[model samples]
Target chain A: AMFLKKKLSAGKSVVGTMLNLVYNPDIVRIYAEAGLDYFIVDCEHAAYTFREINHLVSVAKNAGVSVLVRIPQVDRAHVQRLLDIGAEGFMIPGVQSAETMRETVRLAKYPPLGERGVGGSIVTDFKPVNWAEWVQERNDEIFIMAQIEHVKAVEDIDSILAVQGVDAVIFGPRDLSNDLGIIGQTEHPKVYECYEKVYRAADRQGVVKGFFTAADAAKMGWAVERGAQMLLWSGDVAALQTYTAKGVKTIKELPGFNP
Target chain B: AMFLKKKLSAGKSVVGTMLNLVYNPDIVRIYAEAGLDYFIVDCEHAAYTFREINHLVSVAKNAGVSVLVRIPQVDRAHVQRLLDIGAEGFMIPGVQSAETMRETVRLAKYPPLGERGVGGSIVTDFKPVNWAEWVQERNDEIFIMAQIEHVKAVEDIDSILAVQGVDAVIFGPRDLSNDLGIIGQTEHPKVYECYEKVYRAADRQGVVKGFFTAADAAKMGWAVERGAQMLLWSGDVAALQTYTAKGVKTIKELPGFNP
Candidate 1:
């Protein structure tokens, strides 16, 4: 929350990669030194159990990168447990209405807003201090993005962003494309329009705009230069697969290339 | 760990077990109520990259078990990193000489005593307060063991025990048995004699005595009664595989027994 808020406020571009589909900690160190602003631990699909998230967030946070866990669903248990482990944000998948955002705000905050439970953890010195000050500090700072994935969410962006405590909105291209019956056609007319609609709504409402895994910096330029605040450009598996394929091709091309 | 230090202070038996070939934090959880002392995270054979160890230790600690990581080797980086992650102990492998033991103690402790780098970590409340007091507390509390897995270690037991700051020495039965030309024969006279020699030397020097997995609770009881202060009994995979094998045997023995 601190890292993302400060970076976006300073008019600096924040760049990081998804750890959503896989769980790899050493890759975290590589990305940390690689100058990433955040680490998105994907739980929507890969869904490493809560206990596993404990270490993932701990290591990444120590390295100055905030961990924003992408939970498959939203609830007090999921929100509270991740917060206890010091996760700075929770990216809720499949949010389709203002009701979900209201519920999320209620479960993810403390008094005067909602009822996020007060707990002892390493994050809060096994405690929180300045009772009113700290609760308000976390409530204001913690980031939660209502994923603008389904067609319904794209259509309801205006009402959705009006709900406070919903800090950002992310465009999950594949999900949007699938909802439009185009399957993997992320560049279809409907998908491009979906991205533009949410981007405009998010900007108008003063909420953060975000997206993921752009093919290259040039593509990312369209977002950062325009209005996007968070970008998950690439990650470990891509790097691994790229190098592995290149190595395999080189060895296969060598003279007398026998299996 | 409370199990080791409290037991030593009040003269009680200290018992724990290996997590040798796999990594599972929930197993660390179950062991919390199963009532043993610590969890040994084995990296010598089943090497989980450091980040994975971070999660493993965090969960284990949350379950009230002090994690004792078995690093693949003894070096400053590996030792320092694991300690940074809040691991309470380390089981160092391939320690054959007193020189190696000397180097280990040097790298594992802090200034004026040794050269362990001071770094802020989640494990230490960001940073420990009352600087000198907290460090002295850790020096007195943390456990480090030299694995006596080779034939040379058996001969050099006296010198290894003489190395200050070494908390205990693990009798690596399989490696010792293999090196003695009686592979897997843990009960062989030479192997049995090796245990006796190390136990006696450890007692004479006032260093704690420890051993790896025993066959069952009865075998573990024998060690605890006879000068063996630390007992790391059989663990996770063994339990899982044992139950699986028995279940398969039961189903196969059914009267129909067709498949």
Candidate 2:
């Protein structure tokens, strides 16, 4: 958490990726060396056992990287487990209505503000500190990202964005497109309309909005213009695909193309 | 690179991803947290600037994670830069012939063994140590993985595997298939035949063999059966896709199924 706070204070945006059962340290070393803002260990969909997640989290923390967990759902058990592992932020997926968003905020924030259980072990290095003060300090630092993923979320954009303590909003275009019966139509006119609406809503509410887009430089420029300060251009897989394609093509044409 | 050593000594198979730019510390943190055996920062594909790779290597060493690098080709400049950045291993891609493999090994090894330039700053913390001793120690501990990515590599597998200082071999099924004119056919019979031939050659030569696969238990078992002692499973993008896809799918299907 402290690591994340320092990075954000330095005006760096945190970037994270989901983890699967197979552990890979090379990627982590590269990213950490690259000086990314932070990383997310996605537990919601990634098949990570508790032990694996714990080990992974410890590695991230030791590397001086802030770690966040995207819990599987709004389930209390899952949320509690992730927080216990010392996530700097909790990304709640499928946040639709204002009430849902509010509940997420409530669960993430500490008492006097929300109803998060008091249990600090790994996150705090099992230190015996003043519980009240720690909770208060944590409440101030814990970033809460409410993911807007459905059509209902788009319709209730104002109310959802108005929720207090919601640090950022990540627009889930794929899910939104699916919900609107435009499955995989990320570039559809209706999808663009919905995205624009949510972007404007977040801007009006003075909140940061984030989204993923194609690698096109122009598209990224347009997204930034539309108030998307936190933009995820691509992931490791896309990167691999792009590079591998280019490499194979280059090797194939290398002899003939040699100057 | 210390992190990789720790994990490997504890019987873990470290995985690395290729970086398109200079090493990023945040990415490194993710792999560290993931409990990866080790990570490789790909200088070959990413063409990361020397200074950037240097900074990332420092961060990884501090975090106690093993840092490996995939050089662009069998070039001294690329290998020297990565070594200067404190890489623990070198994954030399496209090792088609024993001669090329020998060149890579020579560049990586030290005096009395191979010809590699001696310069240590951040990698060695600017310590005034004898170059000969440094080379000897590095030769004993440094890992060198040759990527078998072509049909000719399989034909010359015996000689490549017999090369001293070549610690391991990673089968590049994608490239191997492409070389065989079966582009994108990783599971093609010819590819499998080549895989079998290489695996057997490595087994006969008593060298570790590695391969990349999806992060599935079944696939892991299969790779193990194929004599792959080191396995690089699904990477960051694959994890993200699987996570987001399942998360969105589950939420979308919940309404009709539960209601």
> By TM-score, who's the top model here?
1
Q: Estimate each model's TM-score.
A: 0.51, 0.51
Q: Please, what are the lDDT tens digits per residue for candidate 1 over residues A63-119?
A: 787878888778877887787688887888878999999988888888879888887
Q: Each predicted model: what fraction of the native A–B Cα contacts (within 8 Å) does it retain?
A: 0.00, 0.00
lDDT of 2 by residue, A1-259 (tens): 4665554444444444433333454445544654444556666766656676676566676687666677777766766667777667776788877887777777777788898888756758667888868888888787777777788788888898898887777766688789989888878899888878888888788776666664332344455545454544444544444433332233223222111
Worst 10 residues of 2 chain B by lDDT: B250-259
Q: In angstroms, give how far residue A257 of model 1 lies from its true place.
A: 2.1
Candidate 1 CAPRI level: incorrect
Which regions of candidate 1 deviate over 4 angstroms?
A21-24, A214-217, B1-259
- What are the per-residue Cα lDDT tens digits for candidate 1 across B55-153? 777776657677788887788888888887878878888678888878878887887667887777565746546777777777777677878888888
Assess candidate 2 and give its lDDT: 0.65
**Cα-based RMSD of the predictions, in order?**
19.4, 17.0
At residue B2, candidate 2 shows an lDDT of 38
